[PDB]
Ligand binder design. Structure first.
Ligand code: HEM
Length: 184
């Protein structure tokens, strides 16, 4: 199965204005498929208004030296820390170059946030069925280590940080202006 993890708990009372602002950098990630070993850098700029999330996504494939740009949009759950989005493909100037494929979606759960750190989980789906998932440690600073509360949250779901890929050890290239200028 490409079954998504159980026991993924949304943070209680996430500060929305703080989390859904600025740019987040992935510092550590754990793809739950052990054979998924392509190296990636990830950053994004999530925004929220009227119960709808609109986020700009940036990935960089370290192996192939190719970047790609996406935007995602979807309703925020009443718990305020989980959303399911559909995504399109845009160029670096933000113009759509491929429309959203209706059969795909992803569900982001914000498990924990503390200081400059966060822990999220993403369940990818096709036609509403699980096709894979990943845990991501985020920071406002690319080079920073996570707050201990992020580790505490990992421990509750029987994960340890040492299992994660460390992003700062990769030769990343970022488009920071794409994210900085999001919804400007
Ligand atoms: C460090 C964290 C992450 C890593 C390492 C990662 C890795 C990947 C990989 C391996 C792919 C497949 C690319 C390909 O098929 O060539 C991908 C695609 C994608 N991911 Fe991520 N991901 C991360 C976090 C996220 C997050 C947090 C989101 C949403 C908020 C997200 C949304 C997407 C989307 C929309 C695609 C496009 C799939 C496609 O075009 O077929 N990812 N990512």
């Amino acid at each position: 199965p490409g079954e998504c993890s159980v026991n993924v708990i949304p943070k209680k009372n996430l500060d929305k204005a703080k989390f859904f602002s600025g740019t987040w950098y992935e510092t550590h990630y754990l793809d739950m498929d052990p054979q998924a070993t392509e190296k990636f850098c990830f950053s994004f700029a999530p925004r929220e208004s009227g119960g709808t999330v609109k986020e700009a996504l940036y990935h960089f494939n370290v192996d192939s030296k190719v970047s790609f740009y996406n935007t995602g949009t979807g309703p925020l759950e009443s718990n305020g820390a989980k959303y399911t989005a559909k995504f399109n493909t845009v160029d670096k100037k933000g113009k759509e170059i491929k429309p959203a494929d209706e059969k795909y979606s992803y569900t982001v759960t914000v498990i924990e946030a503390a200081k400059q750190s966060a822990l999220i989980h993403i369940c990818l789906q096709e036609d509403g069925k699980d096709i894979g998932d990943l845990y991501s440690v985020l920071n406002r600073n690319k080079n920073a280590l996570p707050n201990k509360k992020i580790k505490k949250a990992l421990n509750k779901v029987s994960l340890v940080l040492t299992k994660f890929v460390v992003t700062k050890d990769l030769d990343c290239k970022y488009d920071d202006k794409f994210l900085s200028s999001w919804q400007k």
